[PDB]
Design a protein around this nucleic acid. Sequence first.
DNA 1: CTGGAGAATCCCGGTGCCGAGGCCGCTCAATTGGTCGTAGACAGCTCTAGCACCGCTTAAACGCACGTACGCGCTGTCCCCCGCGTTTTAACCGCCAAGGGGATTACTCCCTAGTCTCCAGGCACGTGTCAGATATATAC
DNA 2: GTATATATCTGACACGTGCCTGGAGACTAGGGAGTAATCCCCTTGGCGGTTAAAACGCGGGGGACAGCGCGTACGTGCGTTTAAGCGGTGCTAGAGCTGTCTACGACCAATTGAGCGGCCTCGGCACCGGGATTCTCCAG
Lengths: 82, 88, 446, 93, 96, 102, 108, 93, 95
Amino acid sequence: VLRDNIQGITKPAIRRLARRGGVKRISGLIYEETRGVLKVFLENVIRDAVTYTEHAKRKTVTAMDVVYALKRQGRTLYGFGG
Amino acid sequence: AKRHRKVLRDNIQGITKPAIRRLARRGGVKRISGLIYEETRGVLKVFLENVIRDAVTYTEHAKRKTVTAMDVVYALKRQGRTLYGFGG
Amino acid sequence: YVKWGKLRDYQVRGLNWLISLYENGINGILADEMGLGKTLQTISLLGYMKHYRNIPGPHMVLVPKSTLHNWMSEFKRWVPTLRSVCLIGDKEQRAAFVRDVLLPGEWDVCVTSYEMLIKEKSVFKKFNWRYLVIDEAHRIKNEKSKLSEIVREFKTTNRLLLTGTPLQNNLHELWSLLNFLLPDVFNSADDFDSWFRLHMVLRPFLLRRIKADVEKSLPPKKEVKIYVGLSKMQREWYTRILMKDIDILNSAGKMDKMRLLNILMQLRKCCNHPYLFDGAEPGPPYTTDMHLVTNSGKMVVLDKLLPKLKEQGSRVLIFSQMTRVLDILEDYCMWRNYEYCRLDGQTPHDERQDSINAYNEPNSTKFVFMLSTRAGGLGINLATADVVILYDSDWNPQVDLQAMDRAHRIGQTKTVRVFRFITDNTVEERIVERAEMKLRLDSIVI
Amino acid sequence: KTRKESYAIYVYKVLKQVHPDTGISSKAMSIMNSFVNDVFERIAGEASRLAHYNKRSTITSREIQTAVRLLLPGELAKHAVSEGTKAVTKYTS
Amino acid sequence: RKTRKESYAIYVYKVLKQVHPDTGISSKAMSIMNSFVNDVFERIAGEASRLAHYNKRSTITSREIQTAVRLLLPGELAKHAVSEGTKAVTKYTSAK
Amino acid sequence: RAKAKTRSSRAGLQFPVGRVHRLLRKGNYAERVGAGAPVYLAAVLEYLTAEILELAGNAARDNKKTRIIPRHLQLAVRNDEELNKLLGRVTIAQGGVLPNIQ
Amino acid sequence: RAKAKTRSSRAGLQFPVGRVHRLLRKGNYAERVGAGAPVYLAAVLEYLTAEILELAGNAARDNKKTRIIPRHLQLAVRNDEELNKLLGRVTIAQGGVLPNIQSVLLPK
Amino acid sequence: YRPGTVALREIRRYQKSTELLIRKLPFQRLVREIAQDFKTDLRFQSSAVMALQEASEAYLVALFEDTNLAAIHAKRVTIMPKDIQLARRIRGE
Amino acid sequence: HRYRPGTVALREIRRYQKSTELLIRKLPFQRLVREIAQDFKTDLRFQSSAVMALQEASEAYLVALFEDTNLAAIHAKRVTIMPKDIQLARRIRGE
DNA sequence: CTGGAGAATCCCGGTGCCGAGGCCGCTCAATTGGTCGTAGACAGCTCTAGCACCGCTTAAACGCACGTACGCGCTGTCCCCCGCGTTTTAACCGCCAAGGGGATTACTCCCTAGTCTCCAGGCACGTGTCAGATATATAC
DNA sequence: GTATATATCTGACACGTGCCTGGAGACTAGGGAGTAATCCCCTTGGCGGTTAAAACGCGGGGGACAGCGCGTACGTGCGTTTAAGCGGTGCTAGAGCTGTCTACGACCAATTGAGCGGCCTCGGCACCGGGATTCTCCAG
Ligand SMILES: Nc1ncnc2c1ncn2[C@@H]1O[C@H](COP(=O)(O)OP(=O)(O)O)[C@@H](O)[C@H]1O
Ligand SMILES: [Mg+2]
């Protein structure tokens, strides 16, 4: 059973995402706030991706299961066999 | 002159300042700036243009000259503005 | 009992018919030709009851808003003995009249406009009424009109309608008036219709008497028609209306396009004047004093006023069916500097009577009257004048006959002249033809 | 000369089980008919897609169960699935 | 044994060479173009389906596709596209 | 033949199983529809109907009314955290705004 | 039997008319589907394809590289107002953000 | 009464009511002008203009909520044209 | 030598706004995804491209949220992002 | 203000490489032809409701003036990021093994659509009384 | 001590009526679906190796933020004028229905060529290590 890997999303990696988004200066409490925001987004996408796999009676999550889960939530992604 | 006592405003002006203030009061706005009446009219007009253009596309497709309540409800639904009460 | 003047023989004869109906237990409708003095005959009826039968119970008179000051005057002059009270006013004034006058029971007749009734139907419902007399009863020709219903509710011993024009459009309407009066004698529209026989059903409940037989002294009327041709601005506009390419947009935008869902109306607004249509008038300044007369064929022909002002004082009327037309005529008259008067449905009540009187004075400076057929073409009396010009024609022919009779009434001693501006080759020609077809069914029955 | 189907009688039969005393207005009943139509079109759209992704010709109750699980929020989904499975067991008996 | 997988790639290439003769396209940019064509096909076909149900017709036709295109595409893209499709049907019906 | 019983009566439901089956068959969802699909769907629509009317009837009662009106329905949907997520993009006509002043 | 001519050749198109017809028939869009419908739709799909690849090719030549790659496609869609309105809810893989800083953040 | 005392009293009234706040004739005349530019000479159902007015007033009330949270974020109580523009930008419209 | 506070922040914005690489490290994100999956079902296996599809979608979402968050701080007349700016952006979006 | 120093990407020319275009073979969906039957264009009719004038009343909006809540420019304040360097840990790369489970094809036989026939739920219809929407007199 | 609370009508809901057309019976049809079994793609941790990335600490100056004062603008209520709202009346545009007739598409069988995967290779351009300005900063 995996322990808490949400601390594996490092402070340097969150800062590079803020830089691609055009952010010049960042407060210290953004990191704790961003990790929860990411976790809520992943929980919503993975839950549906697994509902699809179960309907198909398969143990492996496929790239299509993820693409269909994102397509429902209004987040079309090109590139993964869509 | 008798021929001209009355004078007509543009139809956007029919949305009066008293009419906008009540809408902002339902939205919980306490104080409001002066330039918002011009800004709000511009915003409503862009909303009405996008809904009406589609409601007329549906009417033309059906070969009818009258816009119906269903033509408006389908146009709002297609834009994510679902409306209950007018059928469908 | 009558005091100011004696009655004409026909008028005495009328009260006899009227009083028989009370004894009979029937109600009915009196229908002499318009302007033959029906009002007085009714005032006498309410006084018969006070003097001879001793019934002073409250009665009701419903009259058009214009005739409210005439109705009152009449009662006072001819039969001062009956007491009367009349309702008109804003919300506040109306309440005070209810509280300080109507409810104290110090009166025997209420006279009020058809409008103030719908506004305050309750206080009216409380009382119990003896006679309900409704002048100008074409306002309740539709069986389902709001007023027609409210009127039916109030309690009543006897009822009389007085209408100059018994027939307006079709038989269903006649059934409607017969029902309010004799609901028992006319249970359904269907029954009245189909069974249809002229005069036989009408004789017991209807009394009609034309001016020619009763008042021989009256000068007979003249019918004339002035066909006209369209001006040039008109010919262009009339065409572009039909083509639906008027374009024309005040706020630049490449002239946009006008909306013309209903076409017959647009063409008629222009056959009157192209100035009515926006943007046709030339230029921002406006104020050109002579362009008006020449830009409309009917106004070119209106130069006839100048001969008539000099040709003795034969005064004229110029009725209309649209307010804007009347606006033009007022600014034009101001340019010629003639003497004029105008009523409209927009005007206040107090002013209406004043302007009927200054004009009716025995030796007044006024020469022309401009009056809308709806607001002022029913019930007022304007006998001083001798010529009638009708700027426009109406779909129902009885709307027209009446406006012509404002002048021709008891007291007229000069021929009443009738003149109608019509355009010879347009849809205006159709409208006039259509009104005529409806009259044929009526035919001024004796 | 033309009939118009609606859910109105079914909405009223359920109303009287939930609240025997109450009634409902015509405006409110028109909103209730619109709710049933909207929800029906959502569930049948996901079912249809599910079948296609998995290459199947039939919509079954197993596809409607999964569509309900994809569409409803968690507390409604667990109850809606319980009500659907109770009905299908009783119907099959 | 190993089953075939259909794609738009050979048509996407043939259209590129008509537009820019000397240029190429990497395998990842091909996966994205194949995704784009399928997204736009599904959008147009879903609107064309509904419009027929609203008007109670059982057939999809070029008229329902023309209305679907005017509802979905932005203003200028819609104009040129409509011309391209009506041109193609005019040429096809001359040669069927 | 035997005397008819509605399929809703067999399932123990108030909503119409037969109409729902026809709607699905004629809506172009799939080329085939199963026999349990209309029963499962009618159960879910009746459950969701009952959830709204229970909250709407409580709102009518607190407001001292016997009759549910469009305002009572808005109050019910917007004060429930799951119904307001199910219905986050719909406008209810003559439905007011929940009262809130910052 | 006469020699076959594929329907795309008859309409003067590069995209496939025959495949589009199958996809529509088997996709549950309607009970029936007309013969002019796949021709109209194939013409629109080829126009929209040429519209993108034209601007992608120009972005590749601006970068001095001979092959279109996934970033070139992003720079094209985002820099055109109508393609950005058509594809406003789409993420493209290996697609960068257009270069951009709010002027408030730049040095004096 | 003091500045803002009546403003809170109106906020409470209007939030309780469920009526339409714009006049019906002045709004119908605007719908018909916008339309003439798309197609000419259309006619309209009486219920179709009411669906447009309900949808319009619902849209503006919801935009005024987002405008007031963007005003309070900048530490003001007065809404201004810039707050409308930030709300419309974050919503992506 | 020393550059001044915020000068290297601008080079970092330009450098990351040119490249299309993934910024979060791959192996750490793969452990995060799998940990989340155990709440829904045990012993799921995973395609390698299914994790890359999740990472591409996740970094695209965070970059776009940081843009809306920055507008809000400039609106409040500041240059530093604060937790209340993420909360305002999500609330106005409808999340 | 601004010369100077010195870290930043920036061209330039060589070096190797597994990506992309070419072709092969041959697979299996498009083609044509013929046929069937029923979607939908046409015309006709009827009659609902939409469009244009007026009239009426009085809520509503107009503009005026009054005065003070609060918009927003400077200043001082002193905390918390930035950037540097350092040390430190865990990412990447490559290599090689076992065996879960995607995938194929094959077989068999339960499922649903089709048809026709049938009769009861649901449609619109026309009343009626009440829930509510204020009128009507109280009441303290 | 006065505003509900007594008090009073009234279109809207709710009842039942009559009526008629989708739901339900009960068989045959022939495909989809399920389940067996096979094969061998791709997944899961093994180790070691060793770069690069994350981590730590802490000098120092940027921006966040509170407070003050200043001043014009938004809200208030007055009287005023305006036209929304409601009835009345005319009329006929064009939604709607039914009816009829015939172009169209789906279907079958049969046919043969575009398009699939497999196996291929010389050339696009990643990478390394040479010098070029030219970003920025600071002590004269
Ligand atoms: N007997 C009479 N003697 C003198 N004048 C009369 C007599 N009867 C009526 N009049 C006048 O003639 C006119 C008749 O018009 P009116 O009373 O309005 O009748 P109607 O209601 O039929 O139009 C009135 O102005 C009245 O003054
Ligand atoms: Mg009179």
